[PDB]
Amino acid sequence: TDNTFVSGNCDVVIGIVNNTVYDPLQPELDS
């Protein structure tokens, strides 16, 4: 999430591909 920014949706940009975005705050929830 630090190297990219969320904008628009997936039905607008042509040629968009599916993938997983790593969130550094998710693994930190255990602490």
Place this chain on the structure above:
Amino acid sequence: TDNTFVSGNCDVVIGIVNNTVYDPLQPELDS
């Protein structure tokens, strides 16, 4: 962590110094 980014290791950079990088998320999890 917001003012710096992670690249390479400490055995490459010549003249690297040791310090503590403040992570804003640490006190937020403590609070």
